[PDB]
């Protein structure tokens, strides 16, 4: 069985992710902060002990399916709002924000990659990093530390599919065309359908790149 | 007097701006990790009380010009090595470096341009990121932390002109044609000319652009 490991599968994109993954025969392991089990890992994507656990944990469940990963989909985000629900900016945002979020939406991509680095090498896997159109244009339901980490989150993509190309590893994004709602208070199903695209055969020679959502 | 803050005042690109600022009559303060007097500023970029201490003393020396700071240059940018001078991919970057890369070229810049509002507001001062190639294509010369962080700091860049601008300061980023040499082991006057340019009267009107050198 193909085996996919998700992030941020939440309600939206996420639901629609799992969904699809599903009725396409694979296994989908979702990571969530909230608690089939064997198919569920909680953890704190802010935390780099949890996220340590929930790998070795997620490579031990893998050993059923031989070891092997076929698709890590990078879908968690997180865009904290300022007193009162506002949008946070640049002249607002505190350290420990920038540094959590930046951990959430740019490293966990990048530990669990790297972390999970023997199954998706042993599968010939795909790594696919859900970006944002905050990445590129200032929009007043994203934040700064959300947009500058999602623009990060684009570069490390292409860094990652150069790093990652000689092992047999593709590594890709995908930017849909609205804020994703899960960072708020059809369309998902093309995002969804796009990251199903990138993840089996049909893709097998694309990496690197980044497909925007119309 | 006119007044710059630069950090990042290395040979090269530093060396070329001081020269064009201070043949143009400016008082310029560079921001360096190494020991007139008075207008050199020895700051470690990598630690947050350091910043703070230097932003303090900054804003005492600018008391003699009025308290008004007409621009800040962040052309500082470290780039760390992997073992044996090797470039350190987005696999073998550690947490520790990551952090340390994302503080000096991106948190950096904004905890200075926050720090130093007062002054840029009483001013209408200008804010000029260098931004680089690497934010934008994989290069053999700048690791990942230096690359992804770059892309950072663009966004951040048009994420700040949002934010300052109705405080009528303008903040833009300009991106040599090549690679910082300061990273490493004629086009150094036009970065210079551009930084120059984007703090001076002839570029009132511009803001949130990022400059590519040819």
Redesign the interface.
Same mark, same amino acid.
């Given at each position: 069985r193909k085996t996919l490991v998700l992030t941020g599968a939440s309600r939206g994109i996420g639901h629609a992710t799992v969904k699809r993954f599903s009725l396409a025969g694979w296994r989908v392991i979702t990571c969530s902060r909230q608690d089939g089990p064997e198919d569920h890992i909680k953890v704190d994507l802010s935390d780099?002990e949890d996220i340590g656990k929930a790998i070795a944990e997620i490579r031990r469940r893998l050993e059923a399916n031989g070891s092997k990963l076929h698709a890590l989909v990078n879908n968690a985000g997180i865009s904290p709002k300022a007193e009162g629900g506002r949008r946070m900016? !640049?002249?607002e945002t505190p #350290?420990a924000v920038?540094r959590d979020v930046?951990q959430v939406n740019? #490293?966990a991509p990048?530990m669990l990659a790297?972390g999970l680095?023997k199954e998706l090498e042993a599968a010939q896997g795909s790594v696919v990093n859900v970006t944002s159109i905050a990445? $590129?244009?200032?929009h007043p339901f994203a934040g =700064?530390a959300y947009? =500058? !980490?999602?623009?990060?989150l *684009? *570069?490390?993509t292409?860094? #990652?599919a $150069?790093?990652?190309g000689p092992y047999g590893i593709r590594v890709n994004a995908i930017a849909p065309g609205e804020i994703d709602t899960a960072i708020l208070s059809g369309k998902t199903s093309e995002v969804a359908e796009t990251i199903y695209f990138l993840c089996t055969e049909t893709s097998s020679y694309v990496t690197g790149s980044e497909i925007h959502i119309n």
């Open positions: 780099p900016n !640049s002249i #350290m920038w930046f740019f #490293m990048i790297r680095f990445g $590129s244009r200032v =700064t947009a =500058t !980490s999602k623009a990060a *684009a *570069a490390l292409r860094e #990652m $150069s790093d990652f």
